[model samples]
Target: SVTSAKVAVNGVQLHYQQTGEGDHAVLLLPGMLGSGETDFGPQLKNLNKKLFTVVAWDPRGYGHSRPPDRDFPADFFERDAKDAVDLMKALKFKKVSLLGWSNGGITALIAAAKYPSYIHKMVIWGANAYVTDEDSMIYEGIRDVSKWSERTRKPLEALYGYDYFARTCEKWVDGIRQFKHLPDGNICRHLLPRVQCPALIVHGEKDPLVPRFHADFIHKHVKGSRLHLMPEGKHNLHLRFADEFNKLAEDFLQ
Candidate 1:
């Protein structure tokens, strides 16, 4: 059974869903404008519950945690990272591992680096440690919701009405663009070396949004990280290949 609730953390009411009662508590972080329900539905339903307790959340401005509206401040990633660790502590989880996708992955990196002892292990996919000019150009290309296929646009539109979803996507694009100006366009590259636990970096070889190089950079910089590439996978590999993704993650976490 899955249980959902909201908790006061980081000055906002954060929404999360928890499944399983296993000793290992794994927190699932959502991608851009994603909630636990929107991003990790398959994993939440299928991850081996006997060995892992899965908790997934909607970051402050997305999903059910709103009213403040998500704005991309320079430290938004850091803010989400802080909120994640605090949320686990507030939930009374003594130690936790992280399973983050895209934006969530970036936040997980920051959390693991900043609070080494509290985070035991991390698994990230579709995430980048730094932004590049090319990446910015790609984001610019996708800024218009009207241009996205109805297939791609409908899911988010159904969750957040079209107006809110459209506006938020624009801001997120603008937010990443802002990072291009930072020294070396660093997002969490500096923090990678500080990560003390085992990390698994999974990438989709054919993923269109985040380049394969991003995974390589993370694997190289994180002291003892492991990298896995799904040759035929795309950006949403976890959802498209849930069985494989869950097994891979379960094996690592165990």
Candidate 2:
């Protein structure tokens, strides 16, 4: 079974699509500018229906959860983290597992640390705990949405019009670039030690956007966390290799 619904929480109406049934719930968090349908269509459709209750949300100011439009303040990640757990709580789930990609993974890392008791386990890929000067420059390079290939830009452009998508992309790049000024360029690294849940850190060995070192940092800092690498994977490995990615995740979640 599947349901498309919205919940009023953290002062915004968060939209979500849910499928399956069980006490064990999985919350899927999307990458930058992603919504449930865009980032995790496979997970929503293919995760074992008898085994898990999966819910993928469109974050506040994103996808269908918009009224205020997207903005990236310094506290954006923290805000997303709070909204994530609160969304789960609003759904009456006492405990939940997080499956996050890219920016969502960063938020998941923070959420796991902030609400240790509420989060049971987490799986993250294309995630990083901190920013580097080099990373900042990379973001700078991609700030121009016009520079992105049509394959990369079309869907998101369809979600938010070309002009809005362009503006949002620039803001997102600036938001991340600012993290470089913070001590150690820390984003979630300091919070890593506080993550109490069992963790799985997945990495695409050849990921161009987020290097393998970022996964290593999380695996190193999160203590008992497991790290898995897809030798042939790219940044969107979870999407490109949905079946394999789901198997690894489902086995771990079980």
Candidate 3:
């Protein structure tokens, strides 16, 4: 049976789903404005259940996790990462492999850098270390268009019904708006070099959100990290190239 659990971290209740049982644990971190139900459903269903213990989390302020009463401070990622580590400890996972996508990628890097002993490996997809002026502007434009704050209260009305889409796109937009102003410097540049664990950076060729150059930047800076480009794929490469992506991931993990 699939295992569902919740834990309090930093005063927020984090909800998570787990499957399988094994010494090797894989923790999945979803993109900004995403949750386990929305982002991890397919992978949790398709991956080899016998070989790995899979976990998917709902980060603070998204999905079942409680939102902060006041606006979160700029260093929120650090706190979030710490909470994740704490959760791992509570679950008795000695070491874990992190699978992070988009903003989640940033969290994974921060966690690995801060607590190297706890992480075994990492796989980052559509991650950005530093946001160029162009990237910042693109996100700003999307926020302006979405009217993030106003829309957040009734998020996902159009995208998916309340049953499936628990967190709204507005929350994602608002979170990004807050994250851009955080004190963390160019993440890819600073953290990638510090990561001593085995790493893989995957990118989609047609990903407009994070351009191909960003992926290349990660590949170049991350010590001993390998890069995989998905041909003719877009931002959501996992969905567009599930079989290919999984094969590469399985091979790398092995």
Candidate 4:
């Protein structure tokens, strides 16, 4: 069963869904236009709870969390990392792990870098530390709304509601293109050195949004991180290969 709640995180009421229970708490951060539940719902249904505690959150400006003040300011991601840290501290989670997907992964990378003492381990999927031409992944996903399916649309509707979904989509796309640097202009490579924890860099070989190069970069920069390249994985590899991905998560988090 899943339990839901709201907690205070740096002036925002952060909403979260949780399952299992353990000293090792796993905090999940969702990607662009994704909710913690919608993005990683499979894990809640499949993970071995005895081995870990699972938690997924709605970041500021998305999901049940409060909306941003004005189109995600320059410090958008820096505050995001701070929010995650505050949430864990409020919960008294001494042994916390982070799992981020796409946009969420970017926040996690920043959080791991910003708060090494709080984060015990990390799993970043479809995330890049620096801005690359391949970043057209962001620009491209937005342009191809024709390809979206119910699997993809369901979350969008729930998070943005039908009324604001279209508006939110365009706004974020514009922000991504205009910023040549990461959300905070701080590169992941610089931050990677600050993260002192086990990391699992997972990526898809045929990722349409983010290419294999992002994974290669993460693997090389984050020392001792285990790398897993799915043979035919795409941006949604975690969803495409839940069992395999979850197994990898289990082993790594252990």
**Order of quality (lDDT):** 1, 2, 4, 3
TM-score of each predicted structure versus truth: 0.98, 0.98, 0.85, 0.91
Clashing pairs for predicted structure model 4, backbone only: none
Weakest 10 consecutive residues of candidate 2 by summed lDDT:
133-142
Residue 253 alpha-carbon offset, candidate 2, angstroms: 0.6
Best by lDDT: 1
RMSD of each: 0.8, 1.0, 4.1, 2.4
Order the candidate numbers by TM-score, best to worst. Answer: 1, 2, 4, 3
Model 1, C-alpha of 32: deviation from truth (Å): 0.5
Give the backbone clash total of model 1: 0
Residue by residue across 121-206, what tens digits does model 3's lDDT show? 88889888766667776675554323444454254433345433433444444555554554553543677778888889999888
Off by over 4 Å in 4: 67-70, 137-147, 181-187
Candidate 4 per-residue lDDT over residues 207-252, each given as its tens digit: 8888787788878878788888888889998898999999998888
Highest TM-score against the true fold, candidate: 1
Q: Report, for every candidate in turn, its global Cα lDDT versus the true structure.
A: 0.93, 0.91, 0.73, 0.78
Q: List the residue pairs that clash in candidate 1.
A: none
Model 2 misplacement above 4 A: none
What ranges in model 1 sit over 4 Å off? none
lDDT of 3: 0.73
Clash pairs, model 3 backbone: 129-188
